Short mmCIF file of C-alpha atoms in Angstrom, two decimals:
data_model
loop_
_atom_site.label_atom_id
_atom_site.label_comp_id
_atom_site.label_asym_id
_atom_site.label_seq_id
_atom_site.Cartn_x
_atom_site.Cartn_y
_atom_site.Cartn_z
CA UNK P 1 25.69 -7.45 -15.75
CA UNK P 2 24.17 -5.54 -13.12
CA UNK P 3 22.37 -2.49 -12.83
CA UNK P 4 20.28 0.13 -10.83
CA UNK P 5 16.83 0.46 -11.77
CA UNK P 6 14.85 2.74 -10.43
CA UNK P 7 10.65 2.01 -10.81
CA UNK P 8 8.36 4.65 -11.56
CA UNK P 9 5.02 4.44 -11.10
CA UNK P 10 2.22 5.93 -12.37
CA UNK P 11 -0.66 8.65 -11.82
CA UNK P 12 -2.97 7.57 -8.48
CA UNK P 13 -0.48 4.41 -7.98
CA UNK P 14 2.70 4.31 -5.58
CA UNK P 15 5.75 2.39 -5.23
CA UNK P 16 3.63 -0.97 -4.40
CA UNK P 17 3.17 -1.62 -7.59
CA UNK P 18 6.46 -2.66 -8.44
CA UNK P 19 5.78 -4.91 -5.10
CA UNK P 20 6.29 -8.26 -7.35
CA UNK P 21 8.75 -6.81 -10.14
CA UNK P 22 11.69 -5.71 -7.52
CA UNK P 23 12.19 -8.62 -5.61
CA UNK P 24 12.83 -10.59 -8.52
CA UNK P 25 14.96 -8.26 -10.36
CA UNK P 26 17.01 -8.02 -6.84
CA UNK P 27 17.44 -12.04 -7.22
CA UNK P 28 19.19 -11.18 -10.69
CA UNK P 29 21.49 -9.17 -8.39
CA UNK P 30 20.34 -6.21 -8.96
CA UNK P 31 19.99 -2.95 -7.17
CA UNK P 32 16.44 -1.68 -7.15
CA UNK P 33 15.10 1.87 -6.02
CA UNK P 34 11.12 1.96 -6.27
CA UNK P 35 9.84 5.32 -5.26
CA UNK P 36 6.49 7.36 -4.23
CA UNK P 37 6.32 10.24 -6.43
CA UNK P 38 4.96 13.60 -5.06
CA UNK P 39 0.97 12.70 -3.23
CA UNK P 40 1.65 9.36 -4.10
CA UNK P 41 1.70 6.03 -2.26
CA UNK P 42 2.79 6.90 1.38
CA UNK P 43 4.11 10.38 0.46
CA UNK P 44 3.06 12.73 3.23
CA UNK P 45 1.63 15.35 0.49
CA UNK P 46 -1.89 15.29 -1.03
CA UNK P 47 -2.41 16.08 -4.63
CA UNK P 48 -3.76 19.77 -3.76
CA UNK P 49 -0.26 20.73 -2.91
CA UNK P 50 1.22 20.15 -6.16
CA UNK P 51 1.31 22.56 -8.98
CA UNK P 52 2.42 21.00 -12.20
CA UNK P 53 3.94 17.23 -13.10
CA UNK P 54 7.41 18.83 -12.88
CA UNK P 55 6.34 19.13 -9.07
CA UNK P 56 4.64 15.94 -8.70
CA UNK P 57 8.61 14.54 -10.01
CA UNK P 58 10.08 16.08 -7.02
CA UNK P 59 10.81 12.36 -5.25
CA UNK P 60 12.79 11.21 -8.69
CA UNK P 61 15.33 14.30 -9.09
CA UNK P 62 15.67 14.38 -5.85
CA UNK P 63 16.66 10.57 -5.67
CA UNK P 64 18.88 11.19 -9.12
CA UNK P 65 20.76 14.27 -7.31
CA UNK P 66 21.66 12.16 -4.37
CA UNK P 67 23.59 10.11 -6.97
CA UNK P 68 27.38 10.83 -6.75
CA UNK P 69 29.13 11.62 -9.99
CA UNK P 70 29.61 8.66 -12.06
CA UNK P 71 26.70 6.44 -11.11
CA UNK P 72 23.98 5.58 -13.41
CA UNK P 73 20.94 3.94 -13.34
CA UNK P 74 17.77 2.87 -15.52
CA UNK P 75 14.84 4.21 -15.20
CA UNK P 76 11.81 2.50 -15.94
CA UNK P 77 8.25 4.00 -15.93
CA UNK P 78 4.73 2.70 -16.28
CA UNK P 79 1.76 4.46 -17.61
CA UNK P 80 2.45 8.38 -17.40
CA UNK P 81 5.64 7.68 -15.61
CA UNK P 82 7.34 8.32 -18.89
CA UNK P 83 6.59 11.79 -18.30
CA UNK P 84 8.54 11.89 -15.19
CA UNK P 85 11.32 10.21 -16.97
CA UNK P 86 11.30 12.81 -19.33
CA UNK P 87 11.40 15.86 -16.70
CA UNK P 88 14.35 13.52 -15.20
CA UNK P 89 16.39 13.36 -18.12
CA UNK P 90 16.27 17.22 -19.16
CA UNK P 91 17.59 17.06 -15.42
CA UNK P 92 20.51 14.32 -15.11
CA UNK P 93 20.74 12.64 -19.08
CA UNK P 94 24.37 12.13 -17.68
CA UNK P 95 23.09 10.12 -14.88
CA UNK P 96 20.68 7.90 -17.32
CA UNK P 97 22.25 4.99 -18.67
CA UNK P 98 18.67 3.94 -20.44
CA UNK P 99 14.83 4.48 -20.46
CA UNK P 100 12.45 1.68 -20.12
CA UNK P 101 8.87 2.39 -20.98
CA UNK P 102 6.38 0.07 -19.56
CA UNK P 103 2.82 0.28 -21.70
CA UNK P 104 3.95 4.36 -20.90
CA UNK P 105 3.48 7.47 -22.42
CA UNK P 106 6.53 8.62 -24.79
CA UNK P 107 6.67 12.01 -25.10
CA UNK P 108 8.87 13.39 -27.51
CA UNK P 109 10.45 16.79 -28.47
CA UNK P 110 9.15 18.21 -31.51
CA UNK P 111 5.69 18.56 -29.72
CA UNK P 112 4.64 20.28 -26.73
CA UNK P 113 4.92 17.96 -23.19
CA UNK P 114 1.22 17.61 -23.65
CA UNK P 115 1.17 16.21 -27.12
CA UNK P 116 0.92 12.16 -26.68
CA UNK P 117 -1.11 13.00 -22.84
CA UNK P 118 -4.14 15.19 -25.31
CA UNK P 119 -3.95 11.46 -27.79
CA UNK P 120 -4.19 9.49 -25.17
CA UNK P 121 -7.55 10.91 -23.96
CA UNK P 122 -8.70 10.61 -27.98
CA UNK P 123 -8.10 7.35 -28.10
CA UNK P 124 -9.53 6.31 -24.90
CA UNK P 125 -12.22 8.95 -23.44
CA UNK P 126 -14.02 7.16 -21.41
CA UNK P 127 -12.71 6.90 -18.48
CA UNK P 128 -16.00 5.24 -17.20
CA UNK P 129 -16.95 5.84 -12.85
CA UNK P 130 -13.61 7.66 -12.34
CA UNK P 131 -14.55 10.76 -10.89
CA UNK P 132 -12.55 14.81 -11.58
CA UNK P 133 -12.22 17.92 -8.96
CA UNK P 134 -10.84 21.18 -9.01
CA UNK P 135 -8.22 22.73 -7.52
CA UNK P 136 -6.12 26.23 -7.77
CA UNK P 137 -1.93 25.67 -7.42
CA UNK P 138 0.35 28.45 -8.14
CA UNK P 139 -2.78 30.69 -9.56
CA UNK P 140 -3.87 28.00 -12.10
CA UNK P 141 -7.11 25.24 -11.99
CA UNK P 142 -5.73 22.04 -11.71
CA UNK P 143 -8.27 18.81 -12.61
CA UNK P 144 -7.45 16.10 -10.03
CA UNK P 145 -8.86 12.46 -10.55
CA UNK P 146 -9.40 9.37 -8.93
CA UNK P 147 -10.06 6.41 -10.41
CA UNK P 148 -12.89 4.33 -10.44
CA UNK P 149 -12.93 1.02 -9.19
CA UNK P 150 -14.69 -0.55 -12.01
CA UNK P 151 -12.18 1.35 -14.69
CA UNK P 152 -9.28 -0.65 -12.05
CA UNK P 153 -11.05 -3.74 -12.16
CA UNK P 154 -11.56 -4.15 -16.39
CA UNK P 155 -9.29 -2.03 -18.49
CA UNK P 156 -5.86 -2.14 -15.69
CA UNK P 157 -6.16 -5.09 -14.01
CA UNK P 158 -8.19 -7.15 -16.31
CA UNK P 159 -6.26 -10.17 -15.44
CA UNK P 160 -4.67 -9.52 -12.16
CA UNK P 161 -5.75 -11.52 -9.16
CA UNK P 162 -8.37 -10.48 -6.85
CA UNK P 163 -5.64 -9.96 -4.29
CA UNK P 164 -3.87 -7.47 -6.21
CA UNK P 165 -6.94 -6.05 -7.43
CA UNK P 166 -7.37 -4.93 -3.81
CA UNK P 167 -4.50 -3.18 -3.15
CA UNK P 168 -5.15 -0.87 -5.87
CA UNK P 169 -8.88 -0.06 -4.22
CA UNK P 170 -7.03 0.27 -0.72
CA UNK P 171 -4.15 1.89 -2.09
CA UNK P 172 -5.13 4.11 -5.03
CA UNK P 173 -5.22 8.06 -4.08
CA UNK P 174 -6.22 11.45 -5.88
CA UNK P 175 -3.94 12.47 -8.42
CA UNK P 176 -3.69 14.88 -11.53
CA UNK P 177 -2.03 14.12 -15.27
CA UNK P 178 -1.48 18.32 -14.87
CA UNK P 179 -2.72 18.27 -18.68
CA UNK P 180 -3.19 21.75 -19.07
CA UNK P 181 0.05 22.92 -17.57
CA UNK P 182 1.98 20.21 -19.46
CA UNK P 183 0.27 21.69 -22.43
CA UNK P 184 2.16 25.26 -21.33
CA UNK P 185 5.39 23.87 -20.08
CA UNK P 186 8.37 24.14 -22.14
CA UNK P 187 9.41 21.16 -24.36
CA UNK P 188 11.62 18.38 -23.69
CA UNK P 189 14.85 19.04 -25.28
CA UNK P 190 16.84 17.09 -27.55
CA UNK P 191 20.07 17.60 -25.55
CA UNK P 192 18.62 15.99 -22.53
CA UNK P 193 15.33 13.54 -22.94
CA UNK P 194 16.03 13.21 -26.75
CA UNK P 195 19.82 12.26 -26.29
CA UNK P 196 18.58 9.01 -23.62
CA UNK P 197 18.18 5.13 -24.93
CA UNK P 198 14.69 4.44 -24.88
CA UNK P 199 13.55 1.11 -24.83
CA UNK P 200 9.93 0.37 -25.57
CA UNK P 201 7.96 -2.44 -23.68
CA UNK P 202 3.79 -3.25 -24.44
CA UNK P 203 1.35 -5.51 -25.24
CA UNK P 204 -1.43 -5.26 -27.64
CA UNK P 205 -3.84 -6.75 -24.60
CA UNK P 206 -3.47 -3.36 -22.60
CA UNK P 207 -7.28 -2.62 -22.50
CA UNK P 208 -6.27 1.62 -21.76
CA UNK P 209 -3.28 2.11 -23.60
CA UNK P 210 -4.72 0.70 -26.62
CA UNK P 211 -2.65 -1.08 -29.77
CA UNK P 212 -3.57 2.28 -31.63
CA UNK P 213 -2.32 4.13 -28.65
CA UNK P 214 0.84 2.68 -28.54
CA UNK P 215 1.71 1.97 -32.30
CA UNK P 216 1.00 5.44 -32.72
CA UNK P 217 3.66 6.10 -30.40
CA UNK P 218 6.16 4.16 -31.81
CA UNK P 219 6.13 6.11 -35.06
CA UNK P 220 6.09 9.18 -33.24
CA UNK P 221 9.40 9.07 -31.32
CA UNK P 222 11.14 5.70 -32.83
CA UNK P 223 12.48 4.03 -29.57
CA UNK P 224 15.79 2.64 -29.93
CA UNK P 225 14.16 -0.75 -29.00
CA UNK P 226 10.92 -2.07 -28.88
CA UNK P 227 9.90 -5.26 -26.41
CA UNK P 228 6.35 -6.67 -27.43
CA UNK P 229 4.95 -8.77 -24.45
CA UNK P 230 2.62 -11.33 -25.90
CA UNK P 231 -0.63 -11.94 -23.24
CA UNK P 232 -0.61 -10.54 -20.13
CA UNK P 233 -2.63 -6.71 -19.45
CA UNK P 234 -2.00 -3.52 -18.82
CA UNK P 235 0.25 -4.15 -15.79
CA UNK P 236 2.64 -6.55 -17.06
CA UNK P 237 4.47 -6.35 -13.76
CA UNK P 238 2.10 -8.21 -12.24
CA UNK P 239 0.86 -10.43 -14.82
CA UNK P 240 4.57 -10.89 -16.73
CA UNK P 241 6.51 -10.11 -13.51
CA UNK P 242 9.22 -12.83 -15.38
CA UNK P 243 9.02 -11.46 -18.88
CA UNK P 244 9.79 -8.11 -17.60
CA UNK P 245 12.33 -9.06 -15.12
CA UNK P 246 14.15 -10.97 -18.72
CA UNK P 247 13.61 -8.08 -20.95
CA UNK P 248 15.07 -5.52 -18.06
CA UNK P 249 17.77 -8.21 -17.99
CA UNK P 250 18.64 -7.70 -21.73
CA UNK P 251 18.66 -4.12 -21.26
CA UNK P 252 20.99 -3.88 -17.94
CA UNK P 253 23.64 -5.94 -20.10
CA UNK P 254 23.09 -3.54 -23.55
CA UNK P 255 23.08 -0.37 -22.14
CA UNK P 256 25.48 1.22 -19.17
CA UNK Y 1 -24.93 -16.68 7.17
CA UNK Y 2 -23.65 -13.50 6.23
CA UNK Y 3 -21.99 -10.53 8.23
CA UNK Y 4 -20.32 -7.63 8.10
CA UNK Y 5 -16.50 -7.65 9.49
CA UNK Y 6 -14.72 -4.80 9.56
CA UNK Y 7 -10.49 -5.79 9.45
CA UNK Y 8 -8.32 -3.61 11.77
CA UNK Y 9 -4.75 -3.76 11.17
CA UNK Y 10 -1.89 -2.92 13.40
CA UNK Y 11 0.37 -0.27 14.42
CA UNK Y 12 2.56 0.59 11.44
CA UNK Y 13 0.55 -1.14 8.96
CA UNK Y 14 -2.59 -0.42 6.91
CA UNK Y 15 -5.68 -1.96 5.45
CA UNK Y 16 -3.71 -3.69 2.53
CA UNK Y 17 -2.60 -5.89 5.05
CA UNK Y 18 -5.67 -7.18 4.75
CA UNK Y 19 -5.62 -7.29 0.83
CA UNK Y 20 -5.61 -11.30 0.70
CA UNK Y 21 -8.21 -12.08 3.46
CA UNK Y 22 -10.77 -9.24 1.78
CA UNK Y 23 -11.98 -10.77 -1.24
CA UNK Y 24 -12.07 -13.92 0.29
CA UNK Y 25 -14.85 -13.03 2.81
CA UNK Y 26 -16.76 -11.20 0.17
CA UNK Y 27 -16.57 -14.79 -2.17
CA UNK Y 28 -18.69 -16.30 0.68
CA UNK Y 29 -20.77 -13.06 1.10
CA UNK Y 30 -20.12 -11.19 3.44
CA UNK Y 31 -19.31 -6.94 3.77
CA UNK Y 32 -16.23 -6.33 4.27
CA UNK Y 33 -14.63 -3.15 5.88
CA UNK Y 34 -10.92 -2.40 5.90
CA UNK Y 35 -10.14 0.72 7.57
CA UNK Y 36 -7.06 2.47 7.63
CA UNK Y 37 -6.51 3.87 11.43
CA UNK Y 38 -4.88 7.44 12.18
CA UNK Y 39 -1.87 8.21 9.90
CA UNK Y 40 -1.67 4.70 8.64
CA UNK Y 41 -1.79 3.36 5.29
CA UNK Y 42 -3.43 6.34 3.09
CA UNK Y 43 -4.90 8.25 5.96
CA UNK Y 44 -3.20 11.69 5.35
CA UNK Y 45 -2.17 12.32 8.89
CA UNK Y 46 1.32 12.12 10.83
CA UNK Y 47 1.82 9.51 13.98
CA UNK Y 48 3.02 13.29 15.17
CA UNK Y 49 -0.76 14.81 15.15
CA UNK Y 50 -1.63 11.60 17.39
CA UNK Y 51 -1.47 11.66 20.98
CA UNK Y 52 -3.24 8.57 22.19
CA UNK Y 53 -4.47 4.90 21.21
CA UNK Y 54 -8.15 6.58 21.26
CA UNK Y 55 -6.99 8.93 19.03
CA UNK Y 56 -5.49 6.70 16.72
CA UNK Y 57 -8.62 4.83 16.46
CA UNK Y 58 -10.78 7.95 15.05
CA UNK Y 59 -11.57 5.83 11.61
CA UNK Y 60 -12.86 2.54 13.67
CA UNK Y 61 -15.13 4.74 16.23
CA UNK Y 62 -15.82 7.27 13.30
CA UNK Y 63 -17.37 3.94 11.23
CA UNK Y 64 -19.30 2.98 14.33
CA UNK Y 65 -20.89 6.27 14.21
CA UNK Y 66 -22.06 6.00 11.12
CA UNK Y 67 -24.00 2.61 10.97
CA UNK Y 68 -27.88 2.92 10.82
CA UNK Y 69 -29.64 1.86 14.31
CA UNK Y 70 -29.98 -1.71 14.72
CA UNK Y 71 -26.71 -2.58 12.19
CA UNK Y 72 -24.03 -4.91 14.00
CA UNK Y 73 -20.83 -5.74 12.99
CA UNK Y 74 -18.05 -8.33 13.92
CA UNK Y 75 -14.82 -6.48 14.58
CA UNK Y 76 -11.47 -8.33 13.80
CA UNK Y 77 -8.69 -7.07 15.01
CA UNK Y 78 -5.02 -7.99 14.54
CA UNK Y 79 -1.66 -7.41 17.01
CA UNK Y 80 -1.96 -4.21 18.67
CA UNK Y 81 -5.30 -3.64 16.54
CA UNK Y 82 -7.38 -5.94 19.95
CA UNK Y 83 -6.57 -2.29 21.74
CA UNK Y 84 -9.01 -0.50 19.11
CA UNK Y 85 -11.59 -3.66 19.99
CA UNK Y 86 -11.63 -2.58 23.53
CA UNK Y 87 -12.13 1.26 23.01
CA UNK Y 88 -14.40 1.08 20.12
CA UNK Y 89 -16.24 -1.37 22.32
CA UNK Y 90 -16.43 1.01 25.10
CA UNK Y 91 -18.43 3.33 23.14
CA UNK Y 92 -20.43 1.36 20.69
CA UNK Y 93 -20.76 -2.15 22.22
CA UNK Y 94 -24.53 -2.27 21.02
CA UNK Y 95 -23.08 -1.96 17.32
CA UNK Y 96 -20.32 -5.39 17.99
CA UNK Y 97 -21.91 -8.71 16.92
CA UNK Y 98 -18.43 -10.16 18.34
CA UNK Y 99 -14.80 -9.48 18.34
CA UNK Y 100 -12.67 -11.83 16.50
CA UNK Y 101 -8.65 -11.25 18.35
CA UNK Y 102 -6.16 -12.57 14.92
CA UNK Y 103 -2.51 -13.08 16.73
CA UNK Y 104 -3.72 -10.08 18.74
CA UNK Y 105 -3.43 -8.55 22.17
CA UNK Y 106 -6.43 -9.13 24.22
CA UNK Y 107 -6.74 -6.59 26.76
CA UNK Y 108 -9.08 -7.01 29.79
CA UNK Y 109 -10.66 -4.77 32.87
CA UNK Y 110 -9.36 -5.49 35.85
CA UNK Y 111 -6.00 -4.17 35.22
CA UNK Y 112 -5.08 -1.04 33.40
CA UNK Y 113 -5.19 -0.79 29.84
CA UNK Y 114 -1.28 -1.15 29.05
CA UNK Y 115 -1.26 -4.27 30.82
CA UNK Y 116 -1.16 -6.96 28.21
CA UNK Y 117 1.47 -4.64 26.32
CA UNK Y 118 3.85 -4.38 29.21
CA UNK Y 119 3.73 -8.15 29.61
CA UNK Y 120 4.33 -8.28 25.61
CA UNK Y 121 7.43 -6.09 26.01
CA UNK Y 122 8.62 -8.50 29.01
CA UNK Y 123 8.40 -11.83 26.61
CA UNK Y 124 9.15 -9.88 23.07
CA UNK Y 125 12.01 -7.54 24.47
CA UNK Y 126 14.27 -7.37 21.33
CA UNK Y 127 12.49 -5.62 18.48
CA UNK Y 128 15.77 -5.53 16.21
CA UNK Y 129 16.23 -3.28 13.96
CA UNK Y 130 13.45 -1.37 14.60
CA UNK Y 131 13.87 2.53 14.95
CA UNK Y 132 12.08 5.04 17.75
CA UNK Y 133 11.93 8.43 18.30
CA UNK Y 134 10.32 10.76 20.58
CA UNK Y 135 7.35 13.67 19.90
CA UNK Y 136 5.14 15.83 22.14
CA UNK Y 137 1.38 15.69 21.60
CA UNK Y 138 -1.13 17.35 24.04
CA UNK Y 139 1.83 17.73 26.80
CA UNK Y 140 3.03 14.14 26.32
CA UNK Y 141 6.10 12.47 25.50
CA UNK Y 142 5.44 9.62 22.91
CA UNK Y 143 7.91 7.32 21.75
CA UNK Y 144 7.11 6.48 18.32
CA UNK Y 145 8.76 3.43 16.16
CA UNK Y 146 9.38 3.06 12.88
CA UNK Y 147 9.24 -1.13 12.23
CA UNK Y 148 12.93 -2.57 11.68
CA UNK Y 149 13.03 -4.59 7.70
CA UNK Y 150 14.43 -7.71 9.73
CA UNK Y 151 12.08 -7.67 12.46
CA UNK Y 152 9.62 -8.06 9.62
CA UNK Y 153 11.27 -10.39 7.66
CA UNK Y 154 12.00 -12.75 10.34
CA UNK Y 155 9.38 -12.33 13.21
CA UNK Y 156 6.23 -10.98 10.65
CA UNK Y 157 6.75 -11.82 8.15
CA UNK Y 158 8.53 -15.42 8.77
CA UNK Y 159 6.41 -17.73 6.45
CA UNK Y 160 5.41 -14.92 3.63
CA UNK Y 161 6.38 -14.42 0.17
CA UNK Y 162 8.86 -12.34 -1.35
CA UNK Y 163 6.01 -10.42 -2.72
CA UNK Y 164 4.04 -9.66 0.38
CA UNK Y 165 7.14 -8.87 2.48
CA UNK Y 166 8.06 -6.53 -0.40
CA UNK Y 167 4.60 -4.68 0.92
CA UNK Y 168 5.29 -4.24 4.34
CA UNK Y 169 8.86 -2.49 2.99
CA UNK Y 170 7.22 -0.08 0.89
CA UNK Y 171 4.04 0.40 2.89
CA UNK Y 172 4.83 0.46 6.63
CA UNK Y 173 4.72 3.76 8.27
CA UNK Y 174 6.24 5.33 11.59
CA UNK Y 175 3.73 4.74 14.49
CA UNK Y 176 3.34 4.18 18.36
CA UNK Y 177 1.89 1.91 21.36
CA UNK Y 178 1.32 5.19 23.13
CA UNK Y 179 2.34 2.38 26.20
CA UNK Y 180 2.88 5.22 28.75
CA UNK Y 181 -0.59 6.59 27.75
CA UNK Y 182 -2.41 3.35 27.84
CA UNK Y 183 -1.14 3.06 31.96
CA UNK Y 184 -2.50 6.55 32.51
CA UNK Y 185 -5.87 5.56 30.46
CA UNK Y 186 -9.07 4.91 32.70
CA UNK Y 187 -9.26 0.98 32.32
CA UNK Y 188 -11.70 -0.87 29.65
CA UNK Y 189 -15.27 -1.19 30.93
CA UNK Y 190 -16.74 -4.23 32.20
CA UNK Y 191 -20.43 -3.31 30.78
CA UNK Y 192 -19.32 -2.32 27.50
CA UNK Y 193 -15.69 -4.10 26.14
CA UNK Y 194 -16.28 -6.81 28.75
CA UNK Y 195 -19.87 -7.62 27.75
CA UNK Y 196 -18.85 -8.18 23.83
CA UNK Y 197 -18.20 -12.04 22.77
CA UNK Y 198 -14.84 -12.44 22.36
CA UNK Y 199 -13.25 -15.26 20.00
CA UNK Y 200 -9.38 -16.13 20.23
CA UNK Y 201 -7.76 -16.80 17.21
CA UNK Y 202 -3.91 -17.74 17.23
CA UNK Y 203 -0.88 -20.42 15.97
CA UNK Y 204 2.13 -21.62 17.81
CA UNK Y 205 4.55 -20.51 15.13
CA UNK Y 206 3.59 -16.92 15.87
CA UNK Y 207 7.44 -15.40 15.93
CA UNK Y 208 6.47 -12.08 17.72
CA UNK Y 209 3.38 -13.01 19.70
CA UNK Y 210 5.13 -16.20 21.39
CA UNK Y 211 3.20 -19.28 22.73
CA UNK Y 212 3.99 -18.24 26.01
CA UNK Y 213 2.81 -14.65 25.33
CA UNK Y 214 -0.73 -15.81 23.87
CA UNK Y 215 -1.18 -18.83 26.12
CA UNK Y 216 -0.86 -16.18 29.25
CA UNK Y 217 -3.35 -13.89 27.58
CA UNK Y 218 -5.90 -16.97 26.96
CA UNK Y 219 -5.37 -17.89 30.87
CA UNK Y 220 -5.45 -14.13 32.02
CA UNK Y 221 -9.22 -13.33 30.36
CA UNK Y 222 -10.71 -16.12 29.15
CA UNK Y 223 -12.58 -15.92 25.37
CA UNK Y 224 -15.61 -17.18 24.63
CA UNK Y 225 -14.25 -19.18 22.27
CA UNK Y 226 -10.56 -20.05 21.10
CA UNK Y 227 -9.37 -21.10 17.55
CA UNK Y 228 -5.72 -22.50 16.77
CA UNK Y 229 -4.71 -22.71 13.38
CA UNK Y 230 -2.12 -24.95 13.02
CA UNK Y 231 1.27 -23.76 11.23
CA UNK Y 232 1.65 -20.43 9.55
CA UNK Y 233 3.06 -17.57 11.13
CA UNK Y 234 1.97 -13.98 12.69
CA UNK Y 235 0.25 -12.92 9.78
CA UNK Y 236 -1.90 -15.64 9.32
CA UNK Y 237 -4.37 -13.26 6.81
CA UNK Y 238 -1.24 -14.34 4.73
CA UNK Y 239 -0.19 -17.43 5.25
CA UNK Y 240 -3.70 -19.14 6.35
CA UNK Y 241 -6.19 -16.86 4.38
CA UNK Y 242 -8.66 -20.11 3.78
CA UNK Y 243 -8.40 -20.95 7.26
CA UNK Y 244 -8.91 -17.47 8.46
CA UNK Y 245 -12.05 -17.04 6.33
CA UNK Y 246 -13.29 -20.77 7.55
CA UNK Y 247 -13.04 -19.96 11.17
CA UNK Y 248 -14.77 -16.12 10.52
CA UNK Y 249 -17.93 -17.87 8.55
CA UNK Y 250 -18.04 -19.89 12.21
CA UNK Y 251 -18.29 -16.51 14.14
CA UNK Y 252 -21.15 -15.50 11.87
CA UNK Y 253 -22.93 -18.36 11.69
CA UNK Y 254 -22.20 -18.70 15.81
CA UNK Y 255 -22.65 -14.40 16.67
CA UNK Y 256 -25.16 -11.89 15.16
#
């Protein structure tokens, strides 16, 4: 079967990472929407303009409300994109045939929207030369973040060419994971986000989201499926553009 | 030897166009700048705030500025990017080791700036399904264009991958020629843009810059030195990365 996916990236990233995943996915035949979130990629805003991650998902709902009754697609998120997937879904569930989570965060519903960001930073820190500002949105102090080069290089893309390596120092901009107004915002709900499929994807080679990380996840909020990539790093649309492309394969012909 | 190049993309495109060719030149040695020009790539400006080529070319003159007396650097430009040559050579010609022209317009001073782009129009009239529009900047119309998918895919594009092509999709922005503000510019300088060394780098299966276009260029100001890469296509940073970075070790061994 086919099916609409629609690639999230993540914090500091834009659409061009999904640069190697869409074309082949559109050989499969299928229809693939990869979008700049909010500050992101070539999005006209900077990061100073945005308020909270509800904000920074602007480019997603809006993309899901230009979808005419009836049509559904499958979202699939890297990194912190499965935060935006979660705003989306308390937004348009009816639209969302399925949830793919790519080495993402999985928030969940009995916890507050800041619950698996707050682990995340336990389990991994150090966030070694990427450097934090300040800014004030909507009468709250926002900490922005780019990251370092050398953070890009080993723990992201550890085994990603030097080519691709590059785009991400050319191409990564300032962004925010809005932790402390996530921490504040109200919870997913079970109606919306907690009544999607949510398939899991990782590998235990991710050198950010760590195995702990993510098999912490996975008890949290039991996904209805769980993909483990063997090899590969972080960004397993770059390094397992095929693998993916299969396993989003799988899901276009399970879930509709 | 080694030097310090400094990559200058074309209208509508960005530094990641450069993404393949950067690492390479760094493997032998060498520094390596990629600049994003006015509201391309990442730079957080509209095509709308610009009202001129010189204007456009802030980042490459703003670089210039910057380098420590007695610091040189060998400028390569590609397309529309041999324009920003010429002005940044008109102000900081003492600064330009040599300017390396990659499948790019080679402007000259004894006719007016536009020139070579007027006589690009006459022998690449058909830009496809490329878009333009119209803005007022500084009490100027400017036509701005917004580069067609199948103008890139066949003419740019020809010889590329899937996965590079998928780039210039997601990443290409709306931009201009400013052509009608190029014939009202005061023409290049003989003393400074006509005193740098110039070196002429070009292949036959250039889809957009045709034979005939390049070969009239060559015979209407004559480089110091001319390379032709056989094969390939316009974006030979692409398609002919190793032969690219072969022929720039050359210029530094050859220009300092």
């Amino acid at each position: 079967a086919f099916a609409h996916f629609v690639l999230i990236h993540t914090i500091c990233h834009g659409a061009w990472i999904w640069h190697k995943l869409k074309p082949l996915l559109e050989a499969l035949g299928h229809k693939v929407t990869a979008l700049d979130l909010a500050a992101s990629g070539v999005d006209p805003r900077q990061i100073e303009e945005i308020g909270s991650f509800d904000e920074y998902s602007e480019p997603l709902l809006t993309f899901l409300e230009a979808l005419p009754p009836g049509e559904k697609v499958i979202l699939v998120g890297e990194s912190c994109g499965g935060l935006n997937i979660a705003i989306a879904a308390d937004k348009y569930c009816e639209k969302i045939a399925a949830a793919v989570f790519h080495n993402s965060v999985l928030p969940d519903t009995e916890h507050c929207p800041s619950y698996v960001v707050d682990k995340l930073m336990e389990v991994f820190p150090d966030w070694k030369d990427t450097t934090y500002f300040t800014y004030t949105k909507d009468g709250k102090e926002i900490t922005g973040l780019k990251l370092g080069f050398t953070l890009l290089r080993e723990n992201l893309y550890t085994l990603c060419g030097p080519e691709e390596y590059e785009l991400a120092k050319m191409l990564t901009r300032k962004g925010s994971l809005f932790q402390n107004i996530l921490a504040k915002r109200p919870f997913f709900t079970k109606e919306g986000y907690g009544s999607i499929k949510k398939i899991y994807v990782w590998t235990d080679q991710d050198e950010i989201f760590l195995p702990e990380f993510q098999l912490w996840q996975i008890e949290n909020y039991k996904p209805d499926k769980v993909y483990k990539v063997e090899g590969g790093d972080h960004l397993l649309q770059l390094t397992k553009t095929k693998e993916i492309a299969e396993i989003l394969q799988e899901v276009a012909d399970t879930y509709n």
